[PDB]
Symmetry: C2
Subunit: 247 residues, 2 copies
């Protein structure tokens, strides 16, 4: 049905030594063969990371890309390049990009369309702030964010959506399995109206925001929770626990 | 004396193969002793670049870094990682970051201070637009940009300043060696007052903005032009021509 999907977002963390260690832990670990795991290291380590991977279920993605393959854009990363080195994914629209780097919805829509055109999968990030939450605006907010992508992307076969409440990112204040499931269901319902049911049925909608080796297990029966996008826990042994949480 | 410094700004360009060819060429060609060459590839290729270089004159640098070494800054580059992988420089303040990515003088200052603090050299870009130039603000502008840095930074041992008129970047409209020579000396003056004589006298000030194999030579006898920061041409053979430009 929808394959369980776990993404590891290392953020700006790592060394060859630490990366080595993570990747090797993955190569060695016992994980169901019906899982899709993606680790996302700093661009500096995409190549290296791709080289250490000796597990079929493990694939590397980048943490961000520009909306052109090549050109006069000093300091950016290209989808063509992350792919050249072996990566298969790219996280677009992450919250950290959104607030700090002023990445607007349109911008992320242009980047998604692009990467997808170049044949890389996309982990598209969406989610509300404590303030949009409190104001009952969670769903408008996510529908705003997705609509901007939908205007551009017609084929979502290679998109994985990761709903991540802004207020749950790295705070340890995760959404409850219950709230997450309903939000996911609503998102999914929203999308079916736009992409058809076959497509929304096959789409993975991960939960992200303080997902750890402990609470992962409590989301195990939530039908519209298809996996996680893990920040802090991705760099800990406990990441393997996340992977097996439905095992 | 000041050692001729040539910087190669790949911008969003390269493949392992195209980078292999560039580096192998640097490796092959007759280049001066006492030249200082820094090739700056996309972050995706830093490590590989560094493993290809065989030439002691050639260093690898990155195109951008954030102002903190580690953290929840999805998609950014760390000075610690570029270093880990063996690059020795970072380009900070490039007009492309200044314009497309809304990077302001402060951010750039903060970035310059951190980078140095972690012991990576900085290639600090400064420059005026067509407007500012036409209006005779060029010194104004660059003194501005430089002071923002001066205020956080004090020891410029490891800084190289790249004066790059915005109107010359990738347009094919290079400054005249006269103008350039003029502008560098003023800037040098200015820094001597703030950084003292010795400092200002050992600090390389580069010219960038359509510096190519054809005109690199026309700057040969300009005392205050210590080298170049090359964009388009760094991808080309004529790059080694720029390095050998000082007869």
């Amino acid at each position: 049905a929808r394959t369980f999907f776990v993404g590891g977002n290392f953020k700006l963390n790592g060394s060859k030594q630490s990366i080595k260690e993570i990747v090797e832990r993955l190569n060695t670990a016992s994980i169901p063969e019906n899982v899709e795991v993606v680790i996302c290291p700093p661009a500096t380590y995409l190549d290296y990371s791709v080289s250490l991977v000796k597990k079929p279920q493990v694939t590397v993605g980048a943490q961000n890309a520009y909306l052109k393959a090549s050109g006069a854009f000093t300091g950016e990363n290209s989808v063509d390049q992350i792919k050249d080195v072996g990566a298969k994914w790219v996280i677009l629209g992450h919250s950290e990009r959104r607030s700090y780097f002023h990445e607007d919805d349109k911008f992320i829509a242009d980047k998604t369309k692009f990467a997808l055109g170049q044949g890389v999968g996309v982990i598209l990030c969406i989610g509300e702030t404590l303030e949009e939450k409190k104001a009952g605006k969670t769903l408008d907010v996510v529908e705003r964010q997705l609509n901007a992508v939908l205007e551009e992307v017609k084929d979502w076969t290679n998109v994985v959506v990761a709903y991540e409440p802004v207020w749950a990112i790295g705070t340890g204040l995760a959404a409850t399995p219950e709230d997450a499931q309903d939000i996911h269901a609503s998102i999914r319902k929203f999308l079916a109206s736009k992409l058809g049911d076959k497509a929304a049925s096959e789409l993975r909608i991960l939960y992200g925001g303080s997902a750890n080796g402990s609470n992962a297990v409590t989301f195990k029966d939530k039908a519209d929770v298809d996996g996680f996008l893990v920040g802090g826990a991705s760099l800990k042994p406990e990441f393997v626990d996340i992977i097996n949480s439905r095992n």
